[PDB]
Amino acid sequence: RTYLYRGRILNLALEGRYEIVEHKPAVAVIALREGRMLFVRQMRPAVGLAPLEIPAGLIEPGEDPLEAARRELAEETGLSGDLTYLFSYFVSPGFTDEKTHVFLAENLKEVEIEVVWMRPEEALERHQRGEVEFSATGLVGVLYYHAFLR
Amino acid sequence: RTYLYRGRILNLALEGRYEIVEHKPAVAVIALREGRMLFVRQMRPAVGLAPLEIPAGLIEPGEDPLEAARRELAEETGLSGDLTYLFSYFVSPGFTDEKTHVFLAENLKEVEIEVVWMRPEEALERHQRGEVEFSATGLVGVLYYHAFLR
């Protein structure tokens, strides 16, 4: 485990042959209201475009997944709600250890990037038409809705 | 766009403040047979464990997504089938440009890591119990099934 770079949100290391990118764990929040899902968009220099995502972010020091989920929902959309843990996933285990914890938010209330309320059916259609790209969190939100929230 | 490292499956660059990891695009194949989903597991040094994934891999030079999907299904499970493009997603647009193209495989036939046939319902239950971890591809497969393949 030799380190080649120790950065802000990532570290680049080598385990002999394998190139490993260490990354802080993250959270994502799925929220549905009046048939619309709470998506967010922001310029992502890594991809050169703004994909359709759901409220998400990195877990800060001293914070657990649930707390980070609450914070991200508030900071990105100005909302708070009753959160329930759903599941987790490694974004790309072939090279990074980033693990994302997904939560469901209910009974939303306004307590205070681009907020994009959109019916998941429309988000899926737009994507199929090539009009918009998805982040893993955005796609997971869309699929989760079609599977359990209809 | 300053490069700090040019590796095998990734490049580490900087766009002033943003740390960007360039990565080859990938493919993932969702396949269902007799109610069981085709999962695969392999040791992932990046995470130190073997998460539940679906046949997947990097697109090779001169190959398009569909062709890579065919190859990965054959190389990892020894199967071939009729493939249909479903959707795509950026694994983590906050730092990497890795884009995954997801396909559905039908009418599987044996033409020639660990092959794990499992009912998606069981995969979800095991995960909820903390018995197994999911890769983004594995979770997407599970959610897609519950949403459109039941």
Side-chain angles (χ1 to χ4, degrees), chain A residues 4-5 7-10 12 17-21 23 44-47 53 87-99 127 133-136 139-140 143 146-148 150, chain B residues 4-5 7-10 12 15 17-21 23 44-47 53 87-99 127 133-136 139-140 143 146-148 150:
Chain A
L4 307 182
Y5 178 78
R8 311 168 187 80
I9 67 165
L10 66 82
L12 175 59
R17 174 183 174 273
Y18 297 94
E19 303 163 300
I20 308 307
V21 174
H23 190 290
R44 293 297 201 181
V47 301
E53 311 184 29
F87 37 62
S88 68
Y89 69 91
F90 287 103
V91 310
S92 188
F95 87 97
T96 184
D97 63 350
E98 179 178 7
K99 189 175 184 180
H127 182 251
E133 304 301 325
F134 276 132
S135 65
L139 178 60
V140 162
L143 296 181
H146 288 266
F148 308 114
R150 293 191 292 180
Chain B
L4 307 182
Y5 178 78
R8 311 168 187 80
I9 67 165
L10 66 82
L12 175 59
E15 278 206 358
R17 174 183 174 273
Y18 297 94
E19 303 163 300
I20 308 307
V21 174
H23 190 290
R44 293 297 201 181
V47 301
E53 311 184 29
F87 37 62
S88 68
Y89 69 91
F90 287 103
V91 310
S92 188
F95 87 97
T96 184
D97 63 350
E98 179 178 7
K99 189 175 184 180
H127 182 251
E133 304 301 325
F134 276 132
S135 65
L139 178 60
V140 162
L143 296 181
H146 288 266
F148 308 114
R150 293 192 292 180

Coordinates of all heavy atoms in Angstrom, one line a residue, chain A residues 4-5 7-10 12 17-21 23 44-47 53 87-99 127 133-136 139-140 143 146-148 150, chain B residues 4-5 7-10 12 15 17-21 23 44-47 53 87-99 127 133-136 139-140 143 146-148 150:
Chain A
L4 N 0.9 7.6 -3.6 CA 1.5 8.5 -4.6 C 0.9 9.9 -4.5 O 1.5 10.8 -5.0 CB 1.2 7.9 -6.0 CG 1.5 6.5 -6.3 CD1 1.2 6.2 -7.8 CD2 3.0 6.2 -6.1
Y5 N -0.2 10.0 -3.8 CA -0.9 11.3 -3.7 C -1.9 11.3 -2.5 O -2.7 10.4 -2.4 CB -1.6 11.7 -5.0 CG -2.3 13.0 -4.9 CD1 -1.7 14.2 -5.0 CD2 -3.7 13.0 -4.9 CE1 -2.4 15.4 -5.0 CE2 -4.4 14.2 -4.9 CZ -3.7 15.4 -4.9 OH -4.4 16.6 -4.9
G7 N -4.6 13.8 -1.2 CA -5.3 15.1 -1.5 C -6.4 15.5 -0.6 O -6.5 15.1 0.6
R8 N -7.3 16.3 -1.1 CA -8.4 16.8 -0.4 C -9.6 15.8 -0.2 O -9.9 15.5 1.0 CB -9.0 18.1 -1.1 CG -7.9 19.1 -1.4 CD -8.5 20.2 -2.4 NE -7.4 21.1 -2.9 CZ -6.6 20.8 -3.9 NH1 -6.7 19.6 -4.5 NH2 -5.7 21.6 -4.3
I9 N -10.1 15.3 -1.3 CA -11.2 14.3 -1.2 C -10.8 13.0 -1.7 O -11.6 12.1 -1.8 CB -12.4 14.8 -2.0 CG1 -12.1 14.8 -3.5 CG2 -12.9 16.1 -1.6 CD1 -13.3 14.8 -4.4
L10 N -9.5 12.8 -2.0 CA -9.0 11.5 -2.4 C -7.5 11.3 -2.2 O -6.7 12.3 -2.2 CB -9.4 11.2 -3.9 CG -8.8 12.1 -5.0 CD1 -7.4 11.6 -5.4 CD2 -9.7 12.1 -6.2
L12 N -4.3 8.7 -3.8 CA -4.0 7.7 -4.8 C -2.9 6.8 -4.3 O -1.9 7.3 -3.8 CB -3.5 8.4 -6.1 CG -3.0 7.5 -7.2 CD1 -4.1 6.5 -7.7 CD2 -2.5 8.3 -8.4
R17 N 0.2 -4.0 -8.0 CA -0.3 -3.8 -9.4 C -1.5 -2.9 -9.4 O -1.7 -2.1 -10.3 CB -0.6 -5.2 -10.0 CG -1.2 -5.1 -11.3 CD -1.6 -6.5 -11.9 NE -2.3 -6.5 -13.1 CZ -3.6 -6.4 -13.2 NH1 -4.4 -6.3 -12.1 NH2 -4.2 -6.4 -14.4
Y18 N -2.4 -3.1 -8.4 CA -3.6 -2.4 -8.3 C -3.5 -0.9 -7.9 O -2.9 -0.5 -6.9 CB -4.6 -3.1 -7.4 CG -5.0 -4.4 -7.8 CD1 -4.3 -5.6 -7.4 CD2 -6.1 -4.6 -8.7 CE1 -4.7 -6.8 -7.8 CE2 -6.4 -5.9 -9.1 CZ -5.7 -7.0 -8.7 OH -6.1 -8.3 -9.1
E19 N -4.2 0.0 -8.7 CA -4.2 1.4 -8.5 C -5.5 1.7 -7.7 O -6.6 1.4 -8.2 CB -4.3 2.1 -9.9 CG -3.1 1.7 -10.8 CD -3.3 2.1 -12.2 OE1 -4.3 1.6 -12.8 OE2 -2.5 2.9 -12.8
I20 N -5.3 2.1 -6.5 CA -6.5 2.4 -5.6 C -6.6 3.9 -5.2 O -5.7 4.5 -4.8 CB -6.3 1.6 -4.3 CG1 -6.1 0.1 -4.6 CG2 -7.5 1.8 -3.4 CD1 -7.1 -0.5 -5.5
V21 N -7.9 4.3 -5.4 CA -8.2 5.7 -5.1 C -9.1 5.7 -3.8 O -10.2 5.2 -3.8 CB -9.0 6.4 -6.2 CG1 -9.5 7.8 -5.7 CG2 -8.2 6.6 -7.4
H23 N -11.3 7.3 -1.0 CA -12.3 8.3 -1.1 C -13.2 8.3 0.2 O -13.6 7.2 0.6 CB -13.1 8.2 -2.4 CG -14.0 9.3 -2.7 ND1 -15.1 9.6 -1.9 CD2 -14.0 10.2 -3.7 CE1 -15.8 10.6 -2.5 NE2 -15.1 11.0 -3.6
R44 N -20.3 19.6 -12.9 CA -19.3 18.6 -12.4 C -18.1 18.6 -13.4 O -18.2 18.0 -14.5 CB -19.9 17.2 -12.4 CG -21.1 16.9 -11.4 CD -20.5 17.1 -10.0 NE -21.4 16.4 -9.0 CZ -21.2 16.4 -7.7 NH1 -20.1 17.0 -7.2 NH2 -22.0 15.7 -6.9
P45 N -17.0 19.3 -13.0 CA -15.9 19.4 -13.9 C -15.3 18.1 -14.3 O -14.7 18.0 -15.3 CB -14.9 20.2 -13.0 CG -15.4 20.0 -11.6 CD -16.9 20.0 -11.7
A46 N -15.5 17.0 -13.5 CA -15.0 15.7 -13.7 C -15.6 15.1 -15.0 O -14.9 14.4 -15.7 CB -15.2 14.8 -12.6
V47 N -16.8 15.5 -15.3 CA -17.5 15.0 -16.4 C -17.9 16.0 -17.5 O -18.3 15.7 -18.6 CB -18.8 14.2 -16.1 CG1 -18.5 13.1 -15.1 CG2 -19.8 15.2 -15.4
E53 N -28.8 14.1 -10.4 CA -28.5 13.4 -9.2 C -29.6 13.7 -8.2 O -30.6 14.3 -8.5 CB -27.1 14.0 -8.7 CG -26.0 14.1 -9.7 CD -24.7 14.5 -9.1 OE1 -24.4 14.3 -7.9 OE2 -23.9 15.2 -9.8
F87 N -30.2 1.3 1.9 CA -29.1 0.4 1.5 C -27.8 1.1 1.1 O -27.8 2.4 1.2 CB -29.5 -0.5 0.3 CG -30.4 0.2 -0.7 CD1 -29.9 1.3 -1.4 CD2 -31.7 -0.2 -0.9 CE1 -30.7 2.0 -2.3 CE2 -32.5 0.4 -1.9 CZ -32.0 1.5 -2.5
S88 N -26.7 0.4 0.8 CA -25.5 1.1 0.5 C -24.8 0.4 -0.7 O -25.2 -0.8 -1.1 CB -24.5 1.0 1.7 OG -24.1 -0.3 2.0
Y89 N -23.9 1.0 -1.3 CA -23.2 0.5 -2.5 C -21.8 1.1 -2.7 O -21.6 2.3 -2.4 CB -24.0 0.6 -3.8 CG -24.2 2.1 -4.3 CD1 -23.3 2.6 -5.2 CD2 -25.2 2.9 -3.8 CE1 -23.4 3.9 -5.6 CE2 -25.4 4.2 -4.2 CZ -24.4 4.7 -5.2 OH -24.6 6.0 -5.6
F90 N -20.9 0.3 -3.3 CA -19.6 0.8 -3.6 C -19.7 1.3 -5.0 O -20.1 0.6 -5.9 CB -18.5 -0.3 -3.5 CG -18.2 -0.7 -2.1 CD1 -18.7 -1.8 -1.5 CD2 -17.4 0.1 -1.3 CE1 -18.4 -2.2 -0.2 CE2 -17.1 -0.2 0.0 CZ -17.6 -1.4 0.6
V91 N -19.4 2.6 -5.2 CA -19.6 3.2 -6.5 C -18.8 2.6 -7.7 O -19.3 2.5 -8.8 CB -19.2 4.7 -6.5 CG1 -19.9 5.4 -5.3 CG2 -17.7 4.9 -6.4
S92 N -17.6 2.0 -7.4 CA -16.8 1.4 -8.4 C -15.7 0.7 -7.7 O -14.6 1.2 -7.7 CB -16.3 2.4 -9.4 OG -15.6 1.8 -10.5
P93 N -16.0 -0.5 -7.1 CA -15.0 -1.3 -6.3 C -13.8 -1.8 -7.1 O -12.8 -2.2 -6.5 CB -15.9 -2.5 -5.8 CG -16.9 -2.6 -6.9 CD -17.3 -1.2 -7.2
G94 N -13.8 -1.6 -8.4 CA -12.6 -2.0 -9.2 C -11.5 -1.0 -9.0 O -10.3 -1.4 -9.4
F95 N -11.7 0.1 -8.4 CA -10.6 1.1 -8.2 C -10.7 2.0 -7.0 O -9.7 2.5 -6.6 CB -10.3 1.9 -9.5 CG -11.2 3.2 -9.6 CD1 -10.7 4.4 -9.2 CD2 -12.4 3.1 -10.2 CE1 -11.4 5.6 -9.4 CE2 -13.2 4.3 -10.3 CZ -12.7 5.5 -9.9
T96 N -11.9 2.2 -6.5 CA -12.1 3.1 -5.4 C -12.9 2.5 -4.3 O -13.7 1.5 -4.5 CB -12.7 4.5 -5.8 OG1 -12.8 5.3 -4.7 CG2 -14.2 4.2 -6.3
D97 N -12.7 3.0 -3.0 CA -13.4 2.4 -1.9 C -14.6 3.3 -1.5 O -15.2 3.1 -0.4 CB -12.5 2.3 -0.7 CG -11.9 3.6 -0.2 OD1 -12.1 4.6 -0.9 OD2 -11.3 3.6 0.9
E98 N -15.0 4.3 -2.3 CA -16.1 5.1 -2.0 C -17.4 4.3 -1.8 O -17.7 3.5 -2.7 CB -16.4 6.2 -3.1 CG -17.6 7.1 -2.8 CD -17.8 8.1 -3.8 OE1 -17.2 8.2 -4.9 OE2 -18.7 9.0 -3.6
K99 N -18.0 4.4 -0.7 CA -19.2 3.7 -0.3 C -20.3 4.8 -0.1 O -20.1 5.7 0.6 CB -19.0 2.9 0.9 CG -20.1 1.9 1.2 CD -19.8 1.1 2.4 CE -20.9 0.0 2.7 NZ -20.5 -0.8 3.9
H127 N -33.8 10.7 -20.1 CA -32.5 10.0 -20.2 C -32.5 9.1 -21.4 O -31.5 9.0 -22.2 CB -32.2 9.2 -19.0 CG -30.9 8.5 -19.0 ND1 -30.8 7.1 -19.1 CD2 -29.6 8.9 -19.0 CE1 -29.5 6.8 -19.2 NE2 -28.8 7.8 -19.1
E133 N -28.1 13.1 -18.5 CA -27.3 12.0 -18.0 C -27.6 11.8 -16.5 O -28.2 12.6 -15.8 CB -25.8 12.4 -18.1 CG -25.4 12.7 -19.5 CD -25.6 11.6 -20.5 OE1 -25.5 10.4 -20.2 OE2 -25.9 12.0 -21.7
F134 N -27.3 10.5 -16.0 CA -27.6 10.2 -14.6 C -26.3 10.0 -13.9 O -25.3 9.5 -14.4 CB -28.3 8.8 -14.6 CG -29.8 8.9 -14.7 CD1 -30.5 8.1 -15.6 CD2 -30.6 9.8 -14.0 CE1 -31.9 8.0 -15.7 CE2 -32.0 9.8 -14.1 CZ -32.6 8.9 -15.0
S135 N -26.4 10.3 -12.6 CA -25.3 9.9 -11.7 C -25.8 8.6 -11.1 O -27.0 8.3 -11.3 CB -25.1 11.0 -10.6 OG -26.2 11.0 -9.7
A136 N -24.9 7.9 -10.5 CA -25.4 6.6 -9.9 C -26.5 6.9 -8.9 O -27.5 6.2 -8.8 CB -24.2 5.9 -9.1
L139 N -29.8 7.6 -10.8 CA -30.4 6.3 -11.4 C -31.0 5.5 -10.3 O -32.1 4.9 -10.4 CB -29.3 5.6 -12.1 CG -29.8 4.2 -12.8 CD1 -30.9 4.5 -13.7 CD2 -28.6 3.6 -13.5
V140 N -30.3 5.3 -9.2 CA -30.7 4.5 -8.0 C -32.1 5.1 -7.5 O -33.0 4.3 -7.3 CB -29.7 4.5 -6.9 CG1 -30.3 4.0 -5.6 CG2 -28.6 3.5 -7.3
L143 N -34.8 4.1 -10.1 CA -35.1 2.7 -10.0 C -35.8 2.3 -8.7 O -36.8 1.5 -8.7 CB -33.9 1.8 -10.3 CG -33.2 2.0 -11.6 CD1 -32.0 1.0 -11.7 CD2 -34.2 1.6 -12.7
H146 N -39.6 3.4 -9.0 CA -40.4 2.5 -9.9 C -40.6 1.1 -9.2 O -41.6 0.5 -9.5 CB -39.7 2.3 -11.2 CG -39.8 3.5 -12.1 ND1 -40.7 3.6 -13.1 CD2 -38.9 4.6 -12.3 CE1 -40.5 4.8 -13.7 NE2 -39.4 5.3 -13.3
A147 N -39.7 0.7 -8.4 CA -39.8 -0.6 -7.7 C -40.6 -0.6 -6.4 O -41.4 -1.5 -6.2 CB -38.4 -1.1 -7.4
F148 N -40.5 0.4 -5.6 CA -41.2 0.4 -4.3 C -42.1 1.6 -4.0 O -42.8 1.6 -3.0 CB -40.2 0.2 -3.2 CG -39.3 -1.0 -3.4 CD1 -37.9 -0.8 -3.6 CD2 -39.8 -2.3 -3.4 CE1 -37.1 -1.9 -3.8 CE2 -39.0 -3.4 -3.5 CZ -37.6 -3.2 -3.7
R150 N -44.4 3.4 -6.1 CA -45.6 3.7 -6.9 C -46.9 3.3 -6.3 O -48.0 3.8 -6.8 CB -45.4 3.1 -8.3 CG -44.3 3.8 -9.1 CD -44.3 3.4 -10.6 NE -43.9 2.0 -10.8 CZ -43.8 1.4 -12.0 NH1 -44.1 2.1 -13.1 NH2 -43.5 0.1 -12.1
Chain B
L4 N -1.1 14.5 -12.9 CA -0.1 14.1 -11.8 C 0.2 12.7 -11.9 O 1.3 12.2 -11.4 CB -0.7 14.4 -10.4 CG -1.3 15.7 -10.1 CD1 -1.8 15.7 -8.7 CD2 -0.3 16.8 -10.3
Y5 N -0.6 11.9 -12.6 CA -0.3 10.5 -12.8 C -1.1 9.9 -14.0 O -2.3 10.2 -14.2 CB -0.8 9.7 -11.5 CG -0.6 8.2 -11.6 CD1 0.6 7.6 -11.4 CD2 -1.7 7.4 -11.7 CE1 0.8 6.2 -11.5 CE2 -1.6 6.0 -11.7 CZ -0.4 5.4 -11.6 OH -0.3 4.1 -11.6
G7 N -1.8 6.3 -15.4 CA -1.7 4.9 -15.1 C -2.3 3.9 -16.1 O -2.5 4.3 -17.3
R8 N -2.6 2.7 -15.6 CA -3.2 1.6 -16.4 C -4.7 1.8 -16.6 O -5.1 1.9 -17.8 CB -2.9 0.3 -15.7 CG -1.5 0.1 -15.2 CD -1.4 -1.1 -14.3 NE 0.0 -1.3 -13.7 CZ 0.4 -0.5 -12.7 NH1 -0.3 0.4 -12.1 NH2 1.7 -0.7 -12.3
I9 N -5.5 1.9 -15.6 CA -6.9 2.1 -15.7 C -7.4 3.5 -15.2 O -8.6 3.7 -15.2 CB -7.7 1.0 -14.9 CG1 -7.5 1.2 -13.4 CG2 -7.3 -0.4 -15.4 CD1 -8.5 0.4 -12.6
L10 N -6.4 4.3 -14.9 CA -6.8 5.7 -14.4 C -5.7 6.7 -14.5 O -4.5 6.3 -14.6 CB -7.3 5.6 -13.0 CG -6.4 5.2 -11.8 CD1 -5.6 6.5 -11.4 CD2 -7.2 4.7 -10.7
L12 N -4.7 10.6 -12.9 CA -5.0 11.6 -11.8 C -4.7 13.0 -12.3 O -3.5 13.2 -12.7 CB -4.3 11.3 -10.5 CG -4.5 12.3 -9.4 CD1 -6.0 12.4 -9.0 CD2 -3.7 11.9 -8.2
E15 N -7.7 20.3 -12.0 CA -8.3 21.5 -12.8 C -8.3 22.7 -11.9 O -9.3 23.3 -11.7 CB -9.7 21.2 -13.4 CG -9.7 20.3 -14.6 CD -10.9 20.5 -15.5 OE1 -11.8 21.3 -15.1 OE2 -11.0 20.0 -16.6
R17 N -8.5 23.5 -8.7 CA -8.9 23.1 -7.3 C -9.4 21.6 -7.3 O -9.1 20.9 -6.4 CB -9.9 24.0 -6.7 CG -10.5 23.6 -5.4 CD -11.6 24.5 -4.9 NE -12.3 24.0 -3.7 CZ -13.3 23.2 -3.7 NH1 -13.8 22.7 -4.8 NH2 -13.8 22.8 -2.5
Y18 N -10.1 21.3 -8.4 CA -10.7 20.0 -8.5 C -9.8 18.8 -8.9 O -9.0 18.9 -9.8 CB -11.9 20.0 -9.5 CG -13.0 20.9 -9.1 CD1 -13.1 22.2 -9.5 CD2 -14.0 20.4 -8.3 CE1 -14.1 23.0 -9.1 CE2 -15.1 21.2 -7.9 CZ -15.1 22.6 -8.3 OH -16.2 23.4 -8.0
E19 N -9.8 17.8 -8.1 CA -9.0 16.6 -8.3 C -9.9 15.6 -9.1 O -10.9 15.2 -8.7 CB -8.7 15.9 -6.9 CG -8.0 16.9 -6.0 CD -8.1 16.4 -4.5 OE1 -9.2 16.3 -4.0 OE2 -7.0 16.3 -3.9
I20 N -9.4 15.3 -10.3 CA -10.1 14.5 -11.3 C -9.4 13.2 -11.6 O -8.3 13.2 -12.0 CB -10.4 15.3 -12.6 CG1 -11.1 16.6 -12.3 CG2 -11.3 14.4 -13.5 CD1 -12.3 16.5 -11.4
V21 N -10.2 12.1 -11.5 CA -9.6 10.8 -11.9 C -10.3 10.3 -13.2 O -11.5 10.1 -13.2 CB -9.9 9.7 -10.8 CG1 -9.5 8.3 -11.2 CG2 -9.2 10.1 -9.5
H23 N -11.1 7.8 -16.0 CA -11.3 6.3 -16.0 C -12.0 5.9 -17.3 O -12.9 6.6 -17.8 CB -12.1 6.0 -14.8 CG -12.2 4.5 -14.5 ND1 -12.9 3.7 -15.2 CD2 -11.7 3.8 -13.4 CE1 -12.8 2.4 -14.7 NE2 -12.1 2.5 -13.6
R44 N -11.9 -7.6 -4.4 CA -11.6 -6.2 -4.8 C -10.7 -5.6 -3.8 O -11.1 -5.1 -2.8 CB -13.0 -5.5 -4.9 CG -13.9 -5.9 -5.9 CD -13.4 -5.7 -7.3 NE -14.4 -5.6 -8.4 CZ -14.2 -5.5 -9.7 NH1 -13.0 -5.4 -10.1 NH2 -15.2 -5.4 -10.5
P45 N -9.4 -5.5 -4.1 CA -8.4 -4.9 -3.2 C -8.7 -3.5 -2.8 O -8.3 -3.1 -1.7 CB -7.1 -5.1 -4.0 CG -7.6 -5.1 -5.5 CD -8.8 -6.0 -5.4
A46 N -9.4 -2.8 -3.6 CA -9.8 -1.4 -3.3 C -10.7 -1.3 -2.1 O -10.7 -0.3 -1.4 CB -10.4 -0.8 -4.6
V47 N -11.5 -2.3 -1.9 CA -12.5 -2.3 -0.8 C -12.2 -3.4 0.3 O -12.7 -3.4 1.4 CB -13.9 -2.5 -1.3 CG1 -14.3 -1.3 -2.2 CG2 -14.2 -3.8 -2.0
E53 N -21.8 -8.1 -7.3 CA -21.9 -7.3 -8.6 C -22.6 -8.1 -9.7 O -23.1 -9.2 -9.4 CB -20.5 -6.9 -9.1 CG -19.6 -6.4 -8.0 CD -18.2 -6.0 -8.5 OE1 -18.1 -5.6 -9.7 OE2 -17.2 -6.0 -7.7
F87 N -29.8 1.9 -19.9 CA -29.4 3.2 -19.5 C -28.0 3.3 -19.1 O -27.2 2.3 -19.1 CB -30.3 3.7 -18.3 CG -30.7 2.6 -17.4 CD1 -29.7 1.9 -16.6 CD2 -32.0 2.1 -17.2 CE1 -30.0 0.9 -15.7 CE2 -32.3 1.1 -16.3 CZ -31.3 0.5 -15.6
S88 N -27.5 4.5 -18.7 CA -26.1 4.7 -18.3 C -26.1 5.6 -17.1 O -27.0 6.3 -16.8 CB -25.3 5.3 -19.5 OG -25.7 6.7 -19.7
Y89 N -24.9 5.6 -16.4 CA -24.8 6.5 -15.2 C -23.3 6.7 -14.9 O -22.4 5.9 -15.2 CB -25.4 5.8 -14.0 CG -24.7 4.6 -13.5 CD1 -23.7 4.6 -12.5 CD2 -25.1 3.3 -14.0 CE1 -23.1 3.5 -12.1 CE2 -24.5 2.2 -13.5 CZ -23.5 2.2 -12.6 OH -22.8 1.1 -12.1
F90 N -23.0 7.9 -14.3 CA -21.7 8.2 -13.9 C -21.6 7.7 -12.5 O -22.4 8.1 -11.6 CB -21.5 9.8 -14.0 CG -21.3 10.3 -15.4 CD1 -22.4 10.9 -16.0 CD2 -20.2 10.1 -16.1 CE1 -22.3 11.4 -17.3 CE2 -20.1 10.6 -17.4 CZ -21.1 11.3 -18.0
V91 N -20.6 6.9 -12.3 CA -20.4 6.2 -11.0 C -20.2 7.2 -9.8 O -20.7 6.9 -8.7 CB -19.2 5.2 -11.0 CG1 -19.3 4.3 -12.1 CG2 -17.9 5.9 -11.0
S92 N -19.6 8.3 -10.0 CA -19.3 9.3 -9.0 C -18.8 10.6 -9.7 O -17.6 10.8 -9.6 CB -18.3 8.8 -7.9 OG -18.2 9.6 -6.8
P93 N -19.7 11.3 -10.3 CA -19.3 12.6 -11.0 C -18.6 13.6 -10.2 O -18.0 14.6 -10.8 CB -20.6 13.0 -11.6 CG -21.6 12.6 -10.6 CD -21.1 11.2 -10.2
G94 N -18.6 13.5 -8.9 CA -17.9 14.4 -8.1 C -16.4 14.4 -8.2 O -15.7 15.3 -7.8
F95 N -15.9 13.3 -8.7 CA -14.4 13.1 -8.9 C -13.9 12.3 -10.1 O -12.7 12.5 -10.4 CB -13.8 12.6 -7.6 CG -13.7 11.1 -7.5 CD1 -12.6 10.4 -7.8 CD2 -14.9 10.4 -7.0 CE1 -12.5 9.0 -7.7 CE2 -14.8 9.0 -6.9 CZ -13.7 8.3 -7.2
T96 N -14.7 11.5 -10.6 CA -14.3 10.7 -11.8 C -15.3 10.7 -12.9 O -16.5 11.1 -12.7 CB -14.1 9.2 -11.4 OG1 -13.6 8.4 -12.5 CG2 -15.4 8.6 -10.9
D97 N -14.8 10.5 -14.1 CA -15.6 10.5 -15.3 C -16.1 9.1 -15.8 O -16.7 9.0 -16.8 CB -14.9 11.2 -16.5 CG -13.6 10.4 -16.9 OD1 -13.2 9.5 -16.2 OD2 -13.0 10.8 -18.0
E98 N -15.8 8.1 -14.9 CA -16.3 6.8 -15.3 C -17.8 6.7 -15.5 O -18.6 7.1 -14.7 CB -15.9 5.7 -14.2 CG -16.4 4.3 -14.5 CD -16.0 3.3 -13.5 OE1 -15.5 3.6 -12.4 OE2 -16.3 2.1 -13.8
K99 N -18.1 6.3 -16.7 CA -19.5 6.1 -17.1 C -19.8 4.7 -17.4 O -19.0 4.0 -18.1 CB -19.8 7.0 -18.4 CG -21.2 7.1 -18.8 CD -21.4 8.0 -20.0 CE -22.9 8.2 -20.3 NZ -23.0 9.2 -21.5
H127 N -28.3 -8.3 2.0 CA -27.7 -7.0 2.2 C -28.3 -6.2 3.4 O -27.5 -5.6 4.1 CB -27.9 -6.1 0.9 CG -27.2 -4.8 1.0 ND1 -27.9 -3.6 1.1 CD2 -25.9 -4.4 1.1 CE1 -27.1 -2.6 1.3 NE2 -25.9 -3.0 1.2
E133 N -22.3 -7.0 0.7 CA -22.2 -5.6 0.2 C -22.6 -5.5 -1.3 O -22.4 -6.5 -2.0 CB -20.8 -5.0 0.4 CG -20.3 -5.1 1.9 CD -21.1 -4.3 2.8 OE1 -21.7 -3.3 2.5 OE2 -21.3 -4.8 4.0
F134 N -23.0 -4.4 -1.7 CA -23.3 -4.2 -3.2 C -22.4 -3.3 -3.9 O -21.8 -2.4 -3.3 CB -24.7 -3.5 -3.3 CG -25.9 -4.5 -3.2 CD1 -27.0 -4.1 -2.4 CD2 -26.0 -5.6 -4.0 CE1 -28.1 -4.9 -2.3 CE2 -27.1 -6.4 -3.9 CZ -28.2 -6.1 -3.1
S135 N -22.2 -3.5 -5.2 CA -21.4 -2.6 -6.0 C -22.6 -1.8 -6.6 O -23.7 -2.2 -6.5 CB -20.6 -3.3 -7.1 OG -21.5 -3.9 -8.0
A136 N -22.3 -0.7 -7.2 CA -23.3 0.1 -7.9 C -24.1 -0.8 -8.9 O -25.3 -0.8 -9.0 CB -22.8 1.3 -8.5
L139 N -26.5 -3.3 -7.2 CA -27.7 -2.6 -6.6 C -28.6 -2.2 -7.8 O -29.8 -2.5 -7.7 CB -27.3 -1.4 -5.8 CG -28.5 -0.6 -5.2 CD1 -29.3 -1.4 -4.3 CD2 -27.9 0.6 -4.5
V140 N -28.1 -1.7 -8.8 CA -28.8 -1.3 -10.0 C -29.6 -2.5 -10.6 O -30.8 -2.4 -10.8 CB -27.9 -0.6 -11.1 CG1 -28.6 -0.6 -12.4 CG2 -27.6 0.8 -10.7
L143 N -32.5 -3.3 -8.1 CA -33.6 -2.4 -8.2 C -34.3 -2.4 -9.6 O -35.5 -2.3 -9.6 CB -33.1 -0.9 -8.0 CG -32.5 -0.7 -6.6 CD1 -32.1 0.8 -6.5 CD2 -33.6 -1.0 -5.5
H146 N -36.8 -5.5 -9.4 CA -38.0 -5.2 -8.7 C -38.9 -4.2 -9.3 O -40.1 -4.2 -9.2 CB -37.6 -4.7 -7.3 CG -37.0 -5.7 -6.4 ND1 -37.8 -6.4 -5.5 CD2 -35.7 -6.1 -6.2 CE1 -37.0 -7.2 -4.8 NE2 -35.7 -7.1 -5.2
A147 N -38.3 -3.3 -10.2 CA -39.1 -2.3 -10.9 C -39.8 -2.8 -12.2 O -40.9 -2.5 -12.4 CB -38.3 -1.1 -11.1
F148 N -39.0 -3.6 -13.0 CA -39.6 -3.9 -14.3 C -39.6 -5.4 -14.7 O -40.1 -5.8 -15.7 CB -38.8 -3.2 -15.3 CG -38.8 -1.7 -15.1 CD1 -37.6 -1.0 -14.9 CD2 -39.9 -0.9 -15.2 CE1 -37.5 0.4 -14.7 CE2 -39.9 0.5 -15.0 CZ -38.7 1.1 -14.8
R150 N -40.5 -8.3 -12.6 CA -41.4 -9.2 -11.8 C -42.7 -9.6 -12.5 O -43.2 -10.7 -12.1 CB -41.6 -8.6 -10.4 CG -40.4 -8.5 -9.6 CD -40.7 -8.2 -8.1 NE -41.2 -6.9 -7.9 CZ -41.5 -6.4 -6.7 NH1 -41.4 -7.1 -5.6 NH2 -42.0 -5.1 -6.7

